[PDB]
């Protein structure tokens, strides 16, 4: 052409390397040595491979260890070089570009064999995705039929195929990481956070974590970064020894946090929402991945600090719309009051949408742009506070 | 991921229009265009220098090395100080510098000699701004 | 005219020289140039000269060769068989 069983001694080197203080870090530099800085980003890559532990309980359960964090930030941050690199790392890996991959490509091809002249079912991208890590290009650019097969994976951790001739609900349990390209293309200062990333909040919030790439133009960064780029040019980093530990740390370590870690986990999340239990869902899933590190069968009470902090890292990204108090509400109160006043004043219960853009948008910044009035009008039309009266005009609800 | 794009926008120049039209007069008038004056190299003899130059693999002098870094943070500065819309394009990502470094590496090959001159380096930087900035025309 | 445009043409016709990081990840190594302007300007003609001189010279267009044309694609071979 051209089960892994490890010899006893280097296994001890694992037990030795685990005794080494910086393994949680020193491995990270060996995680992506080719890559420069963005270490907290490496730290996440460090966790996911060891991410989580299976709980099947007495029955059901199976929250797994599966954790999927989407990477996002400045274009050509070499964010894609990681996944290109990580793809080599995973025993079963997955990598696909956006829009070239389709939801039908993620499961159940069911094409004709065509040599035997008979249709033959084929596992999709997500099925081969099942097990090991999976990289996602242009997840923002992904089709809407896409991510839905994934939401299925996000929850059930499985893929149901009832299509064509036969019903198959198939399990896919696998790590996944999506590459994200901001529509800015720059994420830009301030702005809403989620609205900047695009994609739906239901889709966004469900992700285990979001690392947000950005460039401060450090002087003072890029030069030495270019000096790091100045490498090649010509001419403590374990390479494969971690990859066995990648395998070794899986079946041979089954950590249980016990009592101590739970106590700390609570107060943080209280300040987190001060967040989501989905974040609380990760706080356990994350730290226990750190728990999967160092051959621990019981979680350290002090990991969860930076475990929440690794969440805080994405949280420090949120300092920089639907979630701010009234917004459309005050608008709809004023839209209502405006058309009501026009109703009692004008000889009609209606007024032109153009006249609405004149009587709404112009007067103040509160007043929104025409399309958004129209959104408010739609949401009021669903309330039965208003009548469309066609595209030409706008009417108030009849008694 | 593109290192270069040449904007082809054409504004009529009566002087240039004639002179080019003159070349458009010069042929069909004859089969032989080049003159007054020049002698374009035939490909076979021209090509032979290509890979012959491609065997070189110029090694970068650190002198020009750090200087390219310097103009980079400058380009990492000025392209970002352009900010919103207009002429653009930002952000002056390292891939272009990664290429621009390769450019003098490609440019050095025509000089061969594998010494990577700084003018050889800056020669590409001259083509960088020229790829754009004709949008004022 | 446009010799400056031609000036850069010489670079991709040569390019180089790549790199070997030993990681390994090899870096291009290759020039990707685009030409933006309309109407045609006879820009298509520049590609006619370049690829001709260039070894491994391949002229193409949008439609033209597809992505299936840029990939190995299964097709039935007439006469001798099959589906090579």
Swiss-Prot record, chain A:
| Annotated effect of mutating residue 79 to A | Loss of MCM2-7 complex helicase activity
Location within or outside the cell: Nucleus
Q: Which domain of life is it from?
A: Eukaryota
Record's function text: Acts as a component of the MCM2-7 complex (MCM complex) which is the putative replicative helicase essential for 'once per cell cycle' DNA replication initiation and elongation in eukaryotic cells. The active ATPase sites in the MCM2-7 ring are formed through the interaction surfaces of two neighboring subunits such that a critical structure of a conserved arginine finger motif is provided in trans relative to the ATP-binding site of the Walker A box of the adjacent subunit. The six ATPase active sites, however, are likely to contribute differentially to the complex helicase activity.
Q: What else is known?
A: Present with 8800 molecules/cell in log phase SD medium.
Q: Which family does it belong to?
A: Belongs to the MCM family.
Name of this chain's protein = DNA replication licensing factor MCM4
**What's the source species for this entry?**
Saccharomyces cerevisiae (strain ATCC 204508 / S288c) (Baker's yeast)
Whole-protein coverage range: 468 to 929 of 933
UniProtKB/Swiss-Prot annotation, chain B:
The cellular location(s) given in this protein's UniProt record come to: Cytoplasm; Nucleus
* Family (UniProt): Belongs to the MCM family.
> Which lineage?
Eukaryota, Fungi, Dikarya, Ascomycota, Saccharomycotina
Extra info from the record?
Present with 166 molecules/cell in log phase SD medium.
Protein's job: Acts as a component of the MCM2-7 complex (MCM complex) which is the putative replicative helicase essential for 'once per cell cycle' DNA replication initiation and elongation in eukaryotic cells. Core component of CDC45-MCM-GINS (CMG) helicase, the molecular machine that unwinds template DNA during replication, and around which the replisome is built.
Describe the protein's quaternary organization and the partners it interacts with: Component of the MCM2-7 complex. The complex forms a toroidal hexameric ring with the proposed subunit order MCM2-MCM6-MCM4-MCM7-MCM3-MCM5; loaded onto DNA, forms a head-head double hexamer. Interacts with CSM1 and MCM10.
Q: Indicate the span of the full protein covered.
A: 593 to 729 of 845
Q: Where is this motif: Arginine finger?
A: 1-3
Organism (species): Saccharomyces cerevisiae (strain ATCC 204508 / S288c)
Q: What is this protein called?
A: DNA replication licensing factor MCM7
Lineage top rank: taxon? Eukaryota
């Amino acid at each position: 052409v051209s089960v892994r069983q490890i010899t006893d001694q280097d296994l001890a080197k694992i037990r030795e390397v685990a005794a080494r203080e910086d393994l949680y870090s020193l491995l990270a530099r060996s995680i992506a040595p080719s890559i420069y800085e963005l270490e907290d980003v490496k730290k996440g890559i460090l966790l996911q491979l060891f991410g989580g532990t299976n709980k099947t309980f007495t029955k059901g359960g199976r929250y797994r260890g599966d954790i999927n964090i989407l990477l996002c930030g400045d274009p050509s941050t070499s964010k894609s070089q990681i996944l290109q690199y990580v793809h080599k790392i995973t025993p079963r890996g997955v990598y696909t570009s956006g829009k070239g991959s389709s939801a039908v490509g993620l499961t159940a091809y069911i094409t004709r064999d065509v040599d035997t002249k008979q249709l033959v079912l084929e596992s999709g991208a997500l099925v081969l995705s099942d097990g090991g890590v999976c990289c996602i290009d242009e997840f923002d650019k992904m089709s809407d039929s896409t991510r839905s097969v994934l939401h299925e994976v996000m929850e059930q951790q499985t893929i149901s195929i009832a299509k064509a001739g036969i019903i198959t609900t198939l399990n896919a349990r696998s790590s996944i990481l999506a590459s994200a390209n901001p529509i800015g293309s720059r994420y830009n200062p301030n702005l809403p956070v989620t609205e900047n990333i695009d994609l739906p909040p239901p889709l966004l919030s469900r992700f285990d974590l979001v690392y947000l790439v950005l460039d401060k133009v450090d002087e003072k960064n890029d030069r030495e970064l270019a000096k790091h780029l100045t490498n090649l040019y010509l001419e403590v980093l374990p390479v494969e020894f971690l990859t066995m530990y990648i395998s070794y740390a899986k079946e041979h370590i089954h950590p249980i946090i016990t009592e101590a870690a739970k106590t700390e986990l609570v107060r943080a999340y209280v300040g987190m929402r001060k967040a989501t239990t989905r974040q609380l869902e990760s706080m356990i899933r994350l730290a226990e991945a750190h728990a999967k590190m160092k051959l621990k069968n019981v979680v350290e009470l002090e990991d969860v600090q930076e475990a929440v902090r690794l969440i805080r890292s994405a949280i420090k990204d949120y300092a920089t719309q639907t979630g701010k108090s009234v917004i459309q509400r005050k608008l709809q109160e004023d839209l209502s009051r405006e058309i009501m006043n026009v109703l009692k004043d004008q000889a009609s219960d209606s007024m032109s949408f153009n006249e609405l853009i004149k009587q709404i948008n112009e007067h103040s910044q509160d007043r929104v742009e025409s399309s958004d009035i129209q959104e408010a009008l739609s949401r009021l039309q669903q309330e039965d506070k208003v009548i469309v009266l066609g595209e030409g005009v706008r009417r108030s609800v009849r008694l | 991921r593109f290192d270069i794009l040449f904007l082809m926008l054409d504004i009529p120049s009566r002087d240039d229009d004639e002179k080019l039209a003159e070349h458009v007069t010069y042929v069909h008038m004859h089969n032989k265009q080049p003159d007054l004056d020049f002698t374009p190299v035939e490909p076979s003899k021209m090509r032979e220098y290509i890979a012959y130059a491609k065997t070189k693999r110029p090694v970068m002098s650190e002198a020009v090395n750090d200087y390219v870094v310097q103009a980079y943070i400058r380009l990492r500065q000025d392209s970002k100080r352009e900010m919103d819309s207009k002429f653009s394009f930002g952000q002056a990502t390292p891939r272009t510098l990664l290429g621009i470094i390769r450019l003098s590496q490609a440019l050095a090959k025509l000089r061969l000699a594998d010494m990577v001159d700084i003018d050889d380096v800056e020669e590409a930087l001259r083509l960088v701004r020229v790829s754009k900035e004709s949008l004022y025309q | 005219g446009n010799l400056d445009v031609k000036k850069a043409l010489l670079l991709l016709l040569v390019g180089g020289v790549d790199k070997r990081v030993g990681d390994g990840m090899k870096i291009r190594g290759d020039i990707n140039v685009c030409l933006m302007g309309d109407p045609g300007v006879a820009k298509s003609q520049l590609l006619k000269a370049i690829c001709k001189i260039s070894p491994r010279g391949v002229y193409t267009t949008g439609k033209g060769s597809s992505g299936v044309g840029l990939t190995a694609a299964v097709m039935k071979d007439p006469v001798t068989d099959e589906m090579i």
